[PDB]
Amino acid sequence: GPLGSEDDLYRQSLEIISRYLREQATGSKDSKPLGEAGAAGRRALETLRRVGDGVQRNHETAFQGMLRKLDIKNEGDVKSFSRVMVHVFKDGVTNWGRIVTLISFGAFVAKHLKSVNQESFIEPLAETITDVLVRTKRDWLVKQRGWDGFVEFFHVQDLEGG
């Protein structure tokens, strides 16, 4: 319908997440600026990547272990993926850390897929995670100012000017 049907958050999220998955899966630390996403996209990208790569390393056995179990081979693996997301949000608690983990796990999956040259499942997975992650609690994204709130909450005592 009107403006209430438009989702500018979706545009930014799709942009940031798909890019994040592609740069992470290829090991490309040099990703094109979030100009088409938003000013806060850059801060979100650097923060999301640092936390994502960090939680994976801090929990190598847990993250790599769970990753080995959820090996993508067909479209049927997408259904279980959403269930894993729903499993985390099962209590109804919408927090940024839970969003970063869901994206970090997805990033690890993309990294794993790229390693076996399964790009055909990476693109759909990135978009699926984005839509499912954003649509499940889009009302929360709006309340938290989207990625702007993500960088604000994840980086409270930030210097900003340096």
């Binding site: 769970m66 279980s80 499993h87 985390v88 927090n95 940024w96 839970r98 983990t101």
Partner: peptide, 27 residues
């Protein structure tokens, strides 16, 4: 059947919950 998914979802939960709690309460 579901056990594997339960632990996987719970693991990401355990990690995520403590992670966000760090900023949630302590600022």
């Amino acid at each position: 059947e579901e056990e594997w998914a339960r632990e996987i979802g719970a693991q990401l939960r355990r990690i995520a919950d403590d992670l966000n709690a760090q900023y949630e309460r302590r600022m």
